[PDB]
């Protein structure tokens, strides 16, 4: 009973609402469109290599 | 005599190579115009 009373008294006077402030996921996703831009550059250079391919045979 | 045929045939081959690298460096120009706006509004 004393443990229960101490548990509720330690948690008594902090009763209010809590805002999850800030957008950490918005800043976290800010690497991902740069990464897909890097992937766009990757497919661009892959197409550069594929255009380099056919002049080798002929 | 026939070296002139070689000159005439390789002149347009090196010009075609210059154009083939020209499209590639134009694509790289598009890439660098993409990348200079990245740091422009990074903050």
UniProtKB/Swiss-Prot annotation, chain A:
Assigned GO CC terms: core mediator complex; mediator complex; nucleoplasm; nucleus; ubiquitin ligase complex
Full-protein positions shown: 60 to 117 of 117
One Gene Ontology biological process: protein ubiquitination
Protein's job: Component of the Mediator complex, a coactivator involved in the regulated transcription of nearly all RNA polymerase II-dependent genes. Mediator functions as a bridge to convey information from gene-specific regulatory proteins to the basal RNA polymerase II transcription machinery. Mediator is recruited to promoters by direct interactions with regulatory proteins and serves as a scaffold for theee assembly of a functional pre-initiation complex with RNA polymerase II and the general transcription factors.
Gene Ontology molecular function: transcription coregulator activity; ubiquitin protein ligase activity
Assembly mode: Component of the Mediator complex, which is composed of MED1, MED4, MED6, MED7, MED8, MED9, MED10, MED11, MED12, MED13, MED13L, MED14, MED15, MED16, MED17, MED18, MED19, MED20, MED21, MED22, MED23, MED24, MED25, MED26, MED27, MED29, MED30, MED31, CCNC, CDK8 and CDC2L6/CDK11. The MED12, MED13, CCNC and CDK8 subunits form a distinct module termed the CDK8 module. Mediator containing the CDK8 module is less active than Mediator lacking this module in supporting transcriptional activation.
Positions in coiled-coil regions: none
Compartment list: Nucleus
Keywords: Acetylation, Activator, Disease variant, Epilepsy, Neurodegeneration, Nucleus, Transcription, Transcription regulation
Record protein name field: Mediator of RNA polymerase II transcription subunit 11
Similarity-based family: Belongs to the Mediator complex subunit 11 family.
Record disease entry: Neurodegeneration with developmental delay, early respiratory failure, myoclonic seizures, and brain abnormalities: An autosomal recessive disorder characterized by congenital microcephaly, profound global developmental delay, exaggerated startle response, refractory myoclonic seizures, progressive widespread neurodegeneration, and premature death.
UniProtKB/Swiss-Prot annotation, chain B:
UniProt subcellular location: Nucleus
Tissue and organ expression note: Expressed in brain, heart, kidney, liver, lung, pancreas, placenta and skeletal muscle.
Coiled-coil intervals: 1-38
Family in the record: Belongs to the Mediator complex subunit 30 family.
Stated role: Component of the Mediator complex, a coactivator involved in the regulated transcription of nearly all RNA polymerase II-dependent genes. Mediator functions as a bridge to convey information from gene-specific regulatory proteins to the basal RNA polymerase II transcription machinery. Mediator is recruited to promoters by direct interactions with regulatory proteins and serves as a scaffold for the assembly of a functional preinitiation complex with RNA polymerase II and the general transcription factors.
Subunit structure: Component of the Mediator complex, which is composed of MED1, MED4, MED6, MED7, MED8, MED9, MED10, MED11, MED12, MED13, MED13L, MED14, MED15, MED16, MED17, MED18, MED19, MED20, MED21, MED22, MED23, MED24, MED25, MED26, MED27, MED29, MED30, MED31, CCNC, CDK8 and CDC2L6/CDK11. The MED12, MED13, CCNC and CDK8 subunits form a distinct module termed the CDK8 module. Mediator containing the CDK8 module is less active than Mediator lacking this module in supporting transcriptional activation.
Name listed for the protein in its UniProt record: Mediator of RNA polymerase II transcription subunit 30
Species per Swiss-Prot/TrEMBL record: Homo sapiens (Human)
Lineage, uppermost ranks: Eukaryota, Metazoa, Chordata, Craniata, Vertebrata
Gene name, Swiss-Prot/TrEMBL: MED30
């Amino acid at each position: 009973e004393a443990e229960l009373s101490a548990q509720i008294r330690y948690l008594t006077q902090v009763a209010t609402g809590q805002p999850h402030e800030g957008s950490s996921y918005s800043s976290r996703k800010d690497c991902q469109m740069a990464l897909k831009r890097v992937d766009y550059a990757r497919l661009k250079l892959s197409d550069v290599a594929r255009t380099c391919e056919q002049m080798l045979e002929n | 005599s026939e070296e002139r045929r070689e000159i005439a045939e390789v002149n347009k081959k090196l010009k075609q190579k210059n154009q083939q690298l020209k499209q590639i460096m134009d694509q790289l120009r598009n890439l660098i115009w993409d990348i200079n706006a990245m740091l422009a509004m990074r903050n």
